[PDB]
Symmetry: none
């Protein structure tokens, strides 16, 4: 037949990353 068609659409964006690291300990008591 003729040549292959064009590439498909780009994929969807990736999942979001995981939560960030825990924050620092709070101020002294």
């Amino acid at each position: 037949p003729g040549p292959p068609g064009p590439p498909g659409p780009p994929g969807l964006p990736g999942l979001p990353g995981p939560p960030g690291p825990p924050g620092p300990p709070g101020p002294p008591g």
Copy 2:
């Protein structure tokens, strides 16, 4: 004539880890 378009591509990479959390509560 040319073939149909291909299917959609794979999902992108997972995103980066989030920002650090805020400081914790005051201590005892």
Copy 3:
């Protein structure tokens, strides 16, 4: 005579960054 389908698209964009982490632990005792 339509030829074969094209290849799969390229991979998507990188995802968004995650949310902020949790609050830190409570501070040192006095």
